[PDB]
């Protein structure tokens, strides 16, 4: 049930200075990156071309080499259009791609944030402002929608190219997408008093961590957030309040796909 995400982040500091950087994710694995300094898009995975031929890829990259330069000048020209209404510094963020579902069905999106607020999306055959968006955007929208050729292409990329590509990505990357990596747990404590159960290096993300006295799951166990490691595995911790002296006989228990049913039991 994997989501393919292109994340464009563009900064516009003043009239002249601008940079645009993207990353691409399939699920929670990075497949591409494209740094403002690079003329071309980089693969972060051996399979990042999916099942596209070299022709199909070059053509796709070229589509984008031109979009990057063009997007930039268009935002600049729109700032000229609104001013002094709106002004630099400006941050535009794009989130685009498609979610793939059982078998054939899919759903594409293209969402735009301005100054970190979601305001615009491509939907159907045109750009439209979403709810809560400021009315002034109605001018940029009307101008963007005048560009018939940009619209036709965006429709083609959302409707056809994106799911086609992702269909092929999932095939090329099954091996990495389905990798199983065992977590490793350790315990530690701090004053307030508070026990910690560190679980690190597991993949994929779904995991279970509860403190326990025997077979008794503790009420107050607090799951922290999933933190990433640099080698594409996950880190999580779980904390539990205790009166000093009560540490005796407490276990951290970890369930996870990689372990094939041998839960990690760590006593204190």
């Amino acid at each position, epitope marked *: 049930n994997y989501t393919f995400r292109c994340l464009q982040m563009s900064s516009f500091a003043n009239r002249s200075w601008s940079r645009t950087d993207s990353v691409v994710w399939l699920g929670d694995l990075q497949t591409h990156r494209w740094s403002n300094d690079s003329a071309t898009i980089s693969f972060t995975k051996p399979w990042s071309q999916g099942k596209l031929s070299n022709q199909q890829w070059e053509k796709l990259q070229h589509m984008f080499q*031109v979009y990057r*330069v*063009s997007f930039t*000048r*268009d935002i600049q*020209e*729109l700032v*000229k*259009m609104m*001013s002094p209404k709106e002004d630099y510094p400006i941050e535009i963020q794009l989130s685009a791609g498609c979610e793939m579902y059982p078998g054939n069905a899919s759903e594409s999106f293209l969402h735009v944030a301005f100054q970190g607020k979601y305001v615009v999306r491509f939907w159907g055959t045109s750009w439209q402002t979403v709810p809560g968006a400021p009315s002034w955007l109605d001018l940029p929208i*009307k*101008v*963007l929608n*005048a*560009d*018939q*050729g*940009t619209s036709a292409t965006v429709q083609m990329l959302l409707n056809d190219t994106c799911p086609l590509f992702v269909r092929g990505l999932l095939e090329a990357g099954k091996s990495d997408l389905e990798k199983q990596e065992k977590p490793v747990a350790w315990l530690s404590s701090v004053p307030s008093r508070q026990l910690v159960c560190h679980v690190s290096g597991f993949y994929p993300k779904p995991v279970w961590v509860m403190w326990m006295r025997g077979d008794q799951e503790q009420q107050g166990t607090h799951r922290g957030d999933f933190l990433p490691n640099a080698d594409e595995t996950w880190y999580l911790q779980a904390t539990l309040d205790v009166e000093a002296g009560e540490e005796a006989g407490l276990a951290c228990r970890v369930k996870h796909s990689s372990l094939g049913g041998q839960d990690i039991i760590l006593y204190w």
Partner: T-cell receptor
Amino acid sequence: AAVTQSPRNKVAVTGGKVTLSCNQTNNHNNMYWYRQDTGHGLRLIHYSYGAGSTEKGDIPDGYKASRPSQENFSLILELATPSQTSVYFCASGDEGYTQYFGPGTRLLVLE
Amino acid sequence: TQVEQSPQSLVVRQGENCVLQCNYSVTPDNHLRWFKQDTGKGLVSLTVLVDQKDKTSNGRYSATLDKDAKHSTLHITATLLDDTATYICVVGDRGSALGRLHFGAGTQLIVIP
């Protein structure tokens, strides 16, 4: 989709203030000024996206722009020089890609 | 100088056909427009080509555009005296007012009556 320029032809001395005017009734938000010199294609000097705004084009040096209103776009040369001898076209457009051109104004600046 | 026209000038006898060429490196190339400009006058639009491989016509004028070759030609069938004019190629880099027009320097046609 009509555009007028005034004057249509001007003789001016070095150091003179010259004003070239453009008017359009189409309610077009967008106006543009260009000069045409043989052996070159048209070149953009200044443009405007609406009343009270102007923007530098590719060759702005020696020209000021004035957009007092929706109808009017003016090219002002404060200190005219012989090098501004040319034919000047004004243009207008809505959001779409077409620019509708004026009939052009010929200028000669003498010493 | 991203829009080159050829030939720079030509002389034809009334009744003859001619082909004018335009070659560009503008990016992107949304559309291409041919203007006709009579000596001492304004720019009259003959045709605008917008598709990847495109063909248009307007009386004795016809034109082609190939966006891969970044090439356009303009054909005048059975020239007449009033075709004496400068013919100007123009490329527009957006499908909207966000664009800039890139003008060729033109081709000068003289028709011997």
